[PDB]
Coordinates of C-alpha atoms in Angstrom, one line a residue:
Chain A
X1 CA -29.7 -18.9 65.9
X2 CA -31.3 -16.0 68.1
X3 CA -33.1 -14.2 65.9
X4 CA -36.8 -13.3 65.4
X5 CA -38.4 -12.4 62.5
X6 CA -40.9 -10.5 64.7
X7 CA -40.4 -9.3 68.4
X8 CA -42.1 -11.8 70.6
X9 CA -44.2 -12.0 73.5
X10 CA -44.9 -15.3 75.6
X11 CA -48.0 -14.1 77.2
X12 CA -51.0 -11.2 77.3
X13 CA -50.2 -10.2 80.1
X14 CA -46.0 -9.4 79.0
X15 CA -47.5 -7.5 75.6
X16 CA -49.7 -5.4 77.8
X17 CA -46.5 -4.5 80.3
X18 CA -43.9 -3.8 77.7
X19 CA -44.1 -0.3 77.0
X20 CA -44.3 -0.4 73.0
X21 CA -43.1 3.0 71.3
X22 CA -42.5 2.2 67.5
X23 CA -46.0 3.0 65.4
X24 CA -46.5 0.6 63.1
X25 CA -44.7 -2.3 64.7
X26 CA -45.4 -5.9 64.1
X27 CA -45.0 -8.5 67.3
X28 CA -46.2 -11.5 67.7
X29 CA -48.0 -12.8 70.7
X30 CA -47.0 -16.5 71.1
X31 CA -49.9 -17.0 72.9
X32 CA -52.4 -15.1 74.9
X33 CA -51.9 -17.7 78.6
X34 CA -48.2 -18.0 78.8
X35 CA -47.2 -21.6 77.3
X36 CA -50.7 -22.8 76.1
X37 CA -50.3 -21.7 73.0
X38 CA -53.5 -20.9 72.0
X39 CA -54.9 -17.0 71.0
X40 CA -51.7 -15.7 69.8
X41 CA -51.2 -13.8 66.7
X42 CA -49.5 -10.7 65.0
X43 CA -50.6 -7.5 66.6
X44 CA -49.8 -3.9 64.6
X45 CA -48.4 -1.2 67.5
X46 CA -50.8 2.0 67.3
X47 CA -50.0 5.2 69.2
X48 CA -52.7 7.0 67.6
X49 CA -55.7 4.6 68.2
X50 CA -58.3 5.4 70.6
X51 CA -60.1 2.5 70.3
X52 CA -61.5 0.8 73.5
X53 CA -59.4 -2.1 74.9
X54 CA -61.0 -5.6 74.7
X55 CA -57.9 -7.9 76.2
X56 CA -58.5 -9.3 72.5
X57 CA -58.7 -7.7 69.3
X58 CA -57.7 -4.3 70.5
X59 CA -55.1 -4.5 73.4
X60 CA -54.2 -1.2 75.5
X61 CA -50.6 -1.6 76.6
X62 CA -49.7 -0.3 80.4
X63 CA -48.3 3.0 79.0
X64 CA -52.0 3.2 76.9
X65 CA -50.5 2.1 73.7
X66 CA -53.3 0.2 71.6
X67 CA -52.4 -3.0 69.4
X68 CA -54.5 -4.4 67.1
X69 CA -54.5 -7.7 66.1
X70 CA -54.4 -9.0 62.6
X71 CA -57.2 -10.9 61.9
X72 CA -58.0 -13.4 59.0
X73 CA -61.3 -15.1 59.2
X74 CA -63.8 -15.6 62.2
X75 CA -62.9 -14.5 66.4
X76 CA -61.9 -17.3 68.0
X77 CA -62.7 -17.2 71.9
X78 CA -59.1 -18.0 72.9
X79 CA -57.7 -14.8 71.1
X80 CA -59.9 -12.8 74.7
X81 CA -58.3 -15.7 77.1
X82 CA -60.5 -18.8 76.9
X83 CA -58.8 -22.0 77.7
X84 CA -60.2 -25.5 77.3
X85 CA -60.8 -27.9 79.6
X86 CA -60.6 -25.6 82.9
X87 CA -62.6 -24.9 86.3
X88 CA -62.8 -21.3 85.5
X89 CA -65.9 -19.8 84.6
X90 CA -65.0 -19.2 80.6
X91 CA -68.6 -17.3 80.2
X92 CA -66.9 -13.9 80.5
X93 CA -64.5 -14.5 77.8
X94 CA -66.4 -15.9 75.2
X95 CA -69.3 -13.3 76.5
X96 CA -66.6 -10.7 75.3
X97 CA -65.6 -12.0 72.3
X98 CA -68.8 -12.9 71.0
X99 CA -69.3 -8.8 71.7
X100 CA -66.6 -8.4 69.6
X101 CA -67.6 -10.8 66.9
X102 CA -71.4 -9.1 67.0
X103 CA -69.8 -5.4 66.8
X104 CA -67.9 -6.6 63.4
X105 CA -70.3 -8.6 61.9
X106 CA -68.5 -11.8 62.5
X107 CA -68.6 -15.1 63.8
X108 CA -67.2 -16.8 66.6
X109 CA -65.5 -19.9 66.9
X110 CA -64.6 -21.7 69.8
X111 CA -62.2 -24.5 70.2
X112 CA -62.5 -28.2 70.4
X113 CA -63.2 -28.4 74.2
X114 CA -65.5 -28.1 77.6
X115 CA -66.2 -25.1 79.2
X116 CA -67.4 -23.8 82.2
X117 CA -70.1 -21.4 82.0
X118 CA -71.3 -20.1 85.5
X119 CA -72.5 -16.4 87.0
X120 CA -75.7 -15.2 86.3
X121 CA -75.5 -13.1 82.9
X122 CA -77.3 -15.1 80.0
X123 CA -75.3 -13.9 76.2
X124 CA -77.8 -12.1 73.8
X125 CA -76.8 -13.8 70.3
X126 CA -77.6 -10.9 68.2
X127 CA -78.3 -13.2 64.5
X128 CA -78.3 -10.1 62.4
X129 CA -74.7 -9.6 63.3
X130 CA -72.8 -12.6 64.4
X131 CA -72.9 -16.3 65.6
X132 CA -71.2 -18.9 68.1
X133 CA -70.2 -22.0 66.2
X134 CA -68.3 -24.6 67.9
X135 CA -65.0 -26.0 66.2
X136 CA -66.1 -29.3 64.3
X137 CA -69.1 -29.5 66.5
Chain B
X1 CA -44.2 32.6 102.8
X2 CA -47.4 30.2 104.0
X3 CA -49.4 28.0 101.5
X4 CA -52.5 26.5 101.8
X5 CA -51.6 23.3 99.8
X6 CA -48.3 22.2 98.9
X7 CA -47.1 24.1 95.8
X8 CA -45.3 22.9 92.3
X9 CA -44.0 25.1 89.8
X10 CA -43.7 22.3 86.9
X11 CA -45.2 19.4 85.4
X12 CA -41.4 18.4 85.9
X13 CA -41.3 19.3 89.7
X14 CA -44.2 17.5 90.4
X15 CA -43.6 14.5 88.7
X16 CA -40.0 14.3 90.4
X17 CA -41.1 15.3 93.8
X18 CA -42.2 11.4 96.1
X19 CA -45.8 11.8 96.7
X20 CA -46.5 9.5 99.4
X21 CA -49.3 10.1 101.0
X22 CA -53.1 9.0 99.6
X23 CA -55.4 11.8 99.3
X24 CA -52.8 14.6 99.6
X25 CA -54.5 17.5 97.7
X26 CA -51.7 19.1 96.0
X27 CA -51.1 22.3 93.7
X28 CA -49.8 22.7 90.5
X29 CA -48.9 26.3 89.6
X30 CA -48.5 25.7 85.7
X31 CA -47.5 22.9 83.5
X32 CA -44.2 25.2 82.0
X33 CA -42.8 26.5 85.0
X34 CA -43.7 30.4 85.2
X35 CA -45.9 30.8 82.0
X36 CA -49.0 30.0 84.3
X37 CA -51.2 28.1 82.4
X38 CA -52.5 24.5 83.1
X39 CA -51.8 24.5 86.8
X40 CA -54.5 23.4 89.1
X41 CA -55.4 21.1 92.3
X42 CA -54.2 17.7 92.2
X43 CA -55.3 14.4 94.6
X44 CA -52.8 12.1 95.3
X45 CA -53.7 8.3 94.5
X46 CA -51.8 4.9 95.6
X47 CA -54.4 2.9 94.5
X48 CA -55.8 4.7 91.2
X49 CA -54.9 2.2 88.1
X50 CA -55.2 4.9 85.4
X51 CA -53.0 5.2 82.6
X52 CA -51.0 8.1 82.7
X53 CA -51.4 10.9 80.4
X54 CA -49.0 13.8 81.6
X55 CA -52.2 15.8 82.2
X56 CA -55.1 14.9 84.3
X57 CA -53.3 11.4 85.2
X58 CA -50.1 12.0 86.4
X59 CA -47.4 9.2 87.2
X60 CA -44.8 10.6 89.6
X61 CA -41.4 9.2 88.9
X62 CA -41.7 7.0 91.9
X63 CA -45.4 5.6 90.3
X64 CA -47.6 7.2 92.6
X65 CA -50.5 8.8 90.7
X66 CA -51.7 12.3 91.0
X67 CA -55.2 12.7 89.5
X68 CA -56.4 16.4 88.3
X69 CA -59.7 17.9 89.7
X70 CA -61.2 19.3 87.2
X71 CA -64.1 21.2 87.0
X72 CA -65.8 21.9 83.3
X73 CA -64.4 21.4 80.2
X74 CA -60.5 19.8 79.7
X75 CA -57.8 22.5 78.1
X76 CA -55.0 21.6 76.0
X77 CA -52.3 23.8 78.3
X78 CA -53.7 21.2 80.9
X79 CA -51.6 18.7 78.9
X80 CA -48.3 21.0 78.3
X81 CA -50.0 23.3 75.4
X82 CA -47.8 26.2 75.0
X83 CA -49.4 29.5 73.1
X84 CA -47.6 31.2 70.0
X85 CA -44.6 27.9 70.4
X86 CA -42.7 27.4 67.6
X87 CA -43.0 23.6 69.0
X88 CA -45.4 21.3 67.4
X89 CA -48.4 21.6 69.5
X90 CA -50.5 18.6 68.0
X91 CA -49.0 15.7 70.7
X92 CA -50.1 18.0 73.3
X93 CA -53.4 18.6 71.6
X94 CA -54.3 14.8 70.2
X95 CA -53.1 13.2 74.2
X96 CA -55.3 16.8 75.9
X97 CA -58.4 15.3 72.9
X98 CA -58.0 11.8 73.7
X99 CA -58.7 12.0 77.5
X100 CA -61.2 14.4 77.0
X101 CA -63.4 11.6 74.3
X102 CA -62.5 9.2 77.1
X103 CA -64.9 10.9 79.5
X104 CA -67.0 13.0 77.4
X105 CA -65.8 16.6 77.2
X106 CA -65.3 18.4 75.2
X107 CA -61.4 20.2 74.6
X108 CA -61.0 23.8 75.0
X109 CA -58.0 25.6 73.4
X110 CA -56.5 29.0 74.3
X111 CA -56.3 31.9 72.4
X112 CA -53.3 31.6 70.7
X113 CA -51.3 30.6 66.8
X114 CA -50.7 26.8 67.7
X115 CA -47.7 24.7 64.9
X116 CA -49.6 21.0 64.1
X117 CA -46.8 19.1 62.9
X118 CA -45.6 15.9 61.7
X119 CA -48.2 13.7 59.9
X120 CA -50.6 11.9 62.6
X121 CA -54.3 12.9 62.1
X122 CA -56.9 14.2 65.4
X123 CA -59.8 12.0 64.9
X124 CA -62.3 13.9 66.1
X125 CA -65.6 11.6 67.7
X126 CA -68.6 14.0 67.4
X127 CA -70.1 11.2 69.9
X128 CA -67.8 12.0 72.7
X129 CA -65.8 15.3 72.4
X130 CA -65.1 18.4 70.3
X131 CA -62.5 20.7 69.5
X132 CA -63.7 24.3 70.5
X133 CA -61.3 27.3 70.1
X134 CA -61.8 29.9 73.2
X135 CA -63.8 32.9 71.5
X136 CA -63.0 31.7 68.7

């Protein structure tokens, strides 16, 4: 038993180096750190989309191939690479993905954890478009 | 027989030749060898990290990246448009568009009968770039 039901991808970091060429393709991203298992999902392959690259909704492969991920309910922050429970600043992730969330009128949710939040740039909660609501509080 | 800059006939020729040397201001004589269209000056770049787009990013078969210097607005013969082709000119048109939204210019197309093929639409962003046929 060596078969997929979708081609798969242990990290971000291999779906953005494999040079994807079939439009229309569904893989799956086990997981968006390599292992964790958290942030993965099934991306569709686009050749024709222009959209800018966020490292979480909208990936841009190395060859400049966009895939978009399929999403069913709120952003979560570890679909843009935040992990629980680390020493590294997690501010810029969830700063990106709640950009995301606020561009789509959505919410994001963010895992059952502690972060890190360090730098200098505050995040602008726009209400009108999008909240940050933490997993089961 | 003397050059100012070093000389490529083809997209193809330059992409094979190893470009190793950052800075290198190099010249492309046309995109099709001897129809003399898209050609231009090209720096060489080690440490660019652009994607490569076959027309003002180029990735040399050994990696290195040659980046166009362009001056106005981008043409689509800069990408590998071919005039009056019986080969479907809209790849070579939606990649020439997409880099030219990317940094806000707008596309110019030669005078020419251009074949759009296969079924993948140009989504034109009126924010970014248009489409503009050269004297009409």
């Amino acid at each position: 038993g060596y078969s997929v039901e979708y081609p798969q991808f242990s990290s971000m970091a291999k779906l953005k180096a494999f040079p994807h060429s079939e439009d229309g393709q569904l893989v799956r991203l086990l997981s968006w750190h390599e292992g964790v298992g958290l942030g993965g999902g099934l991306f569709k392959v686009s050749t024709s989309s222009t959209a800018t690259g966020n490292d979480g909704t909208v990936v841009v492969a190395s060859n400049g191939v966009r895939l978009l991920r399929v999403v069913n309910g709120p952003i979560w922050a570890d679909m843009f690479g935040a992990l629980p429970n680390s020493d590294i600043d997690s501010m810029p992730a969830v700063a990106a993905a709640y950009a995301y969330a606020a561009s789509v009128n959505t919410d994001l949710y963010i895992g059952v954890a502690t972060y890190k939040f360090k730098g200098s740039t505050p995040i602008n909660v726009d209400p009108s478009r999008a909240g940050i609501i933490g997993y089961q509080g």
